[PDB]
């Protein structure tokens, strides 16, 4: 049985990210779609938007429990397990039971794989001395605060088919017990021996990075055949010199079996020309980058995970799944409509599904996608000693988007109705924050949008008034430092006698090229800048914006697209992902908009703007449930989006606890009010798109907002049986 699938590709690239188990791995929807069939989560999100038991389930949950002396964390200075938090109160205790699937090379997953995974996170998030080679600045930003909430873990028991763990942590999510009890999932998708080899390769070979790509640095990629060769060499070196790391010896049943797994892993890598080993239902059989082609095959040792509920007890039918990269949308659609491929595994706008015959339409079924959206990210980079200037070698540039009021003005300059009705031909809706109109939170953060008077039509008078104030303030501060910023008689801005230049990146694959053109011609040029749209593909955009330092100043804005692969009832990541300095700020690598690097908007400043000087009037504008008085807001007045990000994501920040649902929603509202005012991202639109699949395929589990991007769809796909 063969399933033929299409992923929309660029001319040269199927993937926009890399296959690696760090937090910098699987950044993109293209790799993640495939990876979510190769790897199983312990407690995955379901199509209803909450976590569900699968490989793992919660056996016991209590709050406010003493951490015992046999619950450990990994100390990265000594590389030893220490009960560093014994005697503290843990907000959360959870006993979690796991099954033990087989990895794709053939050996069974064990508690050593789980403990390696956690040690790796504790190790690579901390710089243990100024020259620690086992450190990644991106990983620290991604995961550091998460790892700080973990007070201790204990292996209670391991049998041939079960693992039991006691977990102690400080996360309490007030609207969901399972999100509280399963905040730390004692499970992993990668065999420790392979991860050990990758860690040793990245630590000691400057050519390889978990997170970074540049001229002499490649971000580690398990599907890259060349990367796989380097990983295999390191793996076979470690098998001889140090097969079992000291810290893992307490967690290994059998040192001979652990040593033999090195050979099992190497033999798989030899057969398949890659390093991708998971414990999911499909193994990666072959990658042909020159053909934009992937083959994955059903793993004959995979079984329905022990704790799957009935809806998720699906046994993936298809023995082989072929993935074809196709670079033209119309061609992709016609190939599925004419029956040459089974699933169009990337969604397109309604207007692309036009012109099909009654027969072509009868041959397909459509599944909605309403979980994708688009925004502009600005590069606000500047020198430590100068808020408005960036030094690149011998040249100094004025960065207009380092001025808060310039970024804020653009919220009102853009005409989102024009973008949605013209560029997306009516197949998108105006969007102002990171919640789409098909998410639970939409009406909870809407009052923030109304507090700012934001509409689908532009307000160019307000935007021009804010822009001109921002530039006047900038020109005056720069004058005191000996720099001249002046509007010429030609209506253009000059900095030290030269035109202010900005470069916008759009995307060759889709309507984002037209978004970039719109921003360059109808915003940048209208504000008096020399502006240019550079149109690039996935790989270039990823490498320029996300995996290299924005200090190079080689882009000023980028047309971002984001997609959820799952329905999510309660997001804990919107503020940290989009507004905070922790994650994409603007990219994952090098300079970010941290309070150490740049001045950051505070809650008080936004409340004063929204209330025309009166704090209470500002709070009233935001529809708050708990933090709705001057007296209650007092401890939050100096918070930045980073504080809101952290209290939502980790459960606590600066001693303030997220201990009610009212507070969760207020933190999102207040976080979003800062995010709009600060204007590092200008949200534009939510996309309304469609997946297509053969009428002869039944898909039982369809995510109502993510459609076929959810691995539950292809896990649940099977031939129609009919005798009509």
Element (H, E) at 589: none
Least distance between Na ion and beta carbon 27 (Å): 19
Q: Are strands 656-657 and 652-653 parallel, antiparallel or unpaired?
A: antiparallel
Q: Which is nearer to Na ion, 135 or 165 (CB)?
A: 135
Q: Are strands 320-326 and 2-8 parallel, antiparallel or unpaired?
A: parallel
Q: Which is nearer to Na ion, 202 or 670 (CB)?
A: 202
Least distance between Na ion and beta carbon 250 (Å): 21
Least distance between Na ion and beta carbon 207 (Å): 7
With H, G, I as helix, E, B as strand and everything else as coil, classify residue 122. Answer: helix
Q: Which is nearer to Na ion, 132 or 698 (CB)?
A: 132
Interface residues with Na ion (CB under 5 A)? Answer: 76, 123, 126, 128, 132, 134-135, 202, 206, 208
Residue-wise burial string across 346-385, b where 16 or more C-beta atoms lie within 10 A, e elsewhere: bbbbeebbeebeeebeebbbbbbbbbbbbbbbbbbbbeee
Q: Which is nearer to Na ion, 289 or 543 (CB)?
A: 543
* CB-based contact 299:316 (threshold 8 Å): no
Please state, in angstroms and rounded to a whole number, the distance separating the CA atoms of residues 404 and 553: 18
Least distance between Na ion and beta carbon 268 (Å): 25
Q: Which is nearer to Na ion, 180 or 209 (CB)?
A: 209
Q: Which two tokens mark 314? A: 């699906």
Burial class (CB in 10 A: 0-12, 13-18, 19+), 723: exposed
Please state, in angstroms and rounded to a whole number, the distance separating the CA atoms of residues 701 and 48: 10
Q: Which is nearer to Na ion, 150 or 413 (CB)?
A: 150
Please state, in angstroms and rounded to a whole number, the distance separating the CA atoms of residues 190 and 39: 8
Give Cα 570 distance to the centre of its chain: 16
Least distance between Na ion and beta carbon 77 (Å): 8
Q: Which is nearer to Na ion, 67 or 201 (CB)?
A: 201
Spatial CA neighbour of 371 closest among 687, 55, 9, 39: 687
Count of CB atoms situated within 10 Å of the CB of 67: 23
Please state, in angstroms and rounded to a whole number, the distance separating the CA atoms of residues 53 and 325: 33
Q: Which is nearer to Na ion, 206 or 426 (CB)?
A: 206
Spatial CA neighbour of 567 closest among 713, 346, 348, 371: 371
Please state, in angstroms and rounded to a whole number, the distance separating the CA atoms of residues 459 and 113: 56
Q: Which is nearer to Na ion, 134 or 483 (CB)?
A: 134
Least distance between Na ion and beta carbon 203 (Å): 7
Q: Which is nearer to Na ion, 200 or 605 (CB)?
A: 200
Q: Which is nearer to Na ion, 128 or 522 (CB)?
A: 128
Residue-wise burial string across 516-538, b where 16 or more C-beta atoms lie within 10 A, e elsewhere: bbbbbebbbbebbbebebbbbbb
Least distance between Na ion and beta carbon 197 (Å): 14
Please state, in angstroms and rounded to a whole number, the distance separating the CA atoms of residues 401 and 467: 11
Task: Tell me the DSSP string of 521-583.
Answer: IIIITTTT-EEEEEEE-HHHHIIIIISS-GGG---SEEEEEEE-SS--SS-S-HHHHHTSSSS
* CB-based contact 117:188 (threshold 8 Å): yes
Q: For residue 623, what are the contacts with CB-CB under 8 A and spacing of at least 6?
A: 446, 447, 448, 669
Spatial CA neighbour of 545 closest among 561, 526, 523: 561
Least distance between Na ion and beta carbon 266 (Å): 22
Q: Which is nearer to Na ion, 10 or 24 (CB)?
A: 24
Please state, in angstroms and rounded to a whole number, the distance separating the CA atoms of residues 298 and 278: 12
Spatial CA neighbour of 586 closest among 634, 551, 540, 535: 551
Least distance between Na ion and beta carbon 713 (Å): 37
End-to-end C-alpha distance for the chain, whole angstroms: 23
Q: Which two tokens mark 200? A: 């040793």
Bridge partners for 563 per DSSP: 372
Q: Which is nearer to Na ion, 79 or 469 (CB)?
A: 79
Burial class (CB in 10 A: 0-12, 13-18, 19+), 310: exposed
Least distance between Na ion and beta carbon 210 (Å): 8
Please state, in angstroms and rounded to a whole number, the distance separating the CA atoms of residues 69 and 260: 34
Dihedral over alpha carbons 217, 220, 222, 227 (to 10 degrees) = 30
Least distance between Na ion and beta carbon 117 (Å): 15
Least distance between Na ion and beta carbon 220 (Å): 9
Least distance between Na ion and beta carbon 587 (Å): 19
Q: Which is nearer to Na ion, 135 or 195 (CB)?
A: 135
Q: Which is nearer to Na ion, 123 or 322 (CB)?
A: 123
In the bound state, the residue with its beta carbon closest to Na ion is: 134
Q: Are strands 717-719 and 389-392 parallel, antiparallel or unpaired?
A: unpaired
Q: Which is nearer to Na ion, 76 or 279 (CB)?
A: 76
């Amino acid at each position: 049985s063969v399933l033929k699938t299409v992923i929309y590709s660029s001319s040269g690239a199927l993937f926009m990210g890399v296959w690696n188990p760090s937090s910098s791995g699987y950044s993109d929807t293209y790799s993640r779609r495939i990876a979510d069939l190769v790897f199983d989560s312990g407690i995955p999100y379901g199509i209803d938007g909450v976590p569900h038991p699968y490989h793992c389930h919660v056996v016991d949950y209590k709050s406010d429990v003493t951490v015992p002396e046999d619950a450990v964390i990994f100390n990265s200075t000594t590389d030893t397990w220490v009960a560093a938090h014994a005697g503290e109160t843990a907000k959360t205790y959870a006993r979690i039971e796991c099954d033990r699937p087989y990895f794709h090379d053939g050996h069974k997953l064990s508690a050593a794989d789980v403990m390696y995974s956690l040690a790796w996170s504790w190790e690579w998030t901390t710089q243990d001395g100024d020259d620690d080679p086992y450190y990644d600045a991106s990983e620290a930003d991604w995961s550091g605060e998460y790892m700080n909430t973990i007070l201790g873990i204990k292996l209670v028991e391991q049998t041939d088919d079960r693992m039991v763990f006691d977990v102690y942590h400080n996360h309490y999510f007030p609207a969901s017990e399972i999100m509280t009890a399963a905040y730390v999932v004692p499970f992993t998708g990668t065999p420790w021996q392979l991860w050990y080899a990758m860690s040793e390769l990245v630590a000691h070979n400057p050519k390889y990075s978990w997170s970074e790509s540049s001229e002499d640095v490649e971000q580690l990629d398990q599907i890259n055949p060349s990367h796989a060769q380097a990983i295999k060499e390191k793996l076979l070196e470690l098998k001889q010199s140090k097969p079992i790391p000291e810290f893992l010896k307490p967690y290994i049943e059998d040192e001979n079996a652990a040593t033999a797994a090195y050979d099992s892993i190497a033999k798989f890598m030899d057969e398949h020309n890659h390093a991708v080993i998971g414990q999911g239902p499909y193994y990666v059989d072959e990658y042909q980058p020159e053909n934009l082609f992937v083959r994955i095959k059903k793993f004959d040792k995979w079984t329905i995970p022990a704790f799957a509920e009935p809806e998720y007890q699906v046994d993936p039918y298809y023995k082989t799944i072929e993935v074809y990269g196709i670079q033209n949308e119309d061609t992709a659609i016609l190939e599925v409509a004419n029956g040459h491929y089974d699933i169009l595994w990337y969604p397109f706008a309604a207007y692309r599904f036009t012109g099909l015959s009654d027969e072509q339409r009868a041959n397909i079924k459509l599944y909605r996608s309403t979980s994708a959206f688009g925004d502009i990210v600005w590069n606000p980079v500047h020198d430590q000693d100068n808020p408005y200037v960036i030094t690149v070698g011998d040249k100094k540039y004025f960065n207009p988007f380092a001025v808060r009021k310039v970024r804020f003005a653009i919220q009102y300059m853009v005409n989102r109705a024009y973008i949605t009705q013209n560029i997306f031909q009516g197949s998108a809706g105006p969007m102002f924050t990171p919640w789409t109109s098909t998410e639970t939170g939409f009406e909870y953060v809407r009052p923030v949008v109304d507090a700012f008077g934001l509409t689908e039509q532009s307000d160019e008078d307000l935007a021009m008034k804010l822009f001109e104030e921002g530039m006047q303030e900038a020109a005056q501060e720069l004058a005191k430092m000996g720099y001249e910023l002046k509007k010429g008689d030609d209506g253009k801005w000059y900095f030290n006698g030269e035109p202010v230049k900005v470069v916008g990146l759009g995307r060759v694959e889709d309507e984002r090229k037209d978004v970039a053109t719109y921003i360059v011609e109808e915003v940048m040029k209208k504000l008096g800048f020399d502006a240019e749209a550079k149109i690039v593909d996935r790989r270039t955009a990823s490498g320029t914006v996300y995996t290299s330092d924005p200090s190079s100043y080689q882009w000023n804005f980028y047309t971002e697209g984001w997609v959820s692969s799952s329905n999510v009832k309660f997001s804990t990541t919107r503020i940290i992902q989009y507004y905070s300095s922790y994650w994409y700020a603007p990219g994952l690598v090098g300079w970010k908009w941290t309070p150490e690097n740049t001045q950051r908007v505070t809650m008080e400043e936004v409340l004063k703007f929204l209330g025309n000087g009166d704090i209470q009037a500002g709070l009233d504008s935001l529809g708050l449930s708990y933090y709705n008085t001057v007296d209650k807001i007092q401890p939050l007045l100096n918070w930045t989006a980073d504080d809101f990000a952290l209290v939502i994501y980790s459960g606590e920040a600066n001693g303030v606890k997220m201990d009610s649902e009212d507070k969760y929603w207020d933190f999102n509202r207040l976080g979003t009010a800062i995010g709009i005012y600060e204007g590092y991202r200008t949200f534009l639109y939510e996309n309304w798109e469609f997946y297509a699949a053969s009428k002869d395929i039944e898909i039982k589990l369809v995510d109502p907002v993510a459609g076929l991007a959810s691995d539950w769809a292809i896990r649940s796909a099977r031939p129609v049986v009919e005798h009509h």
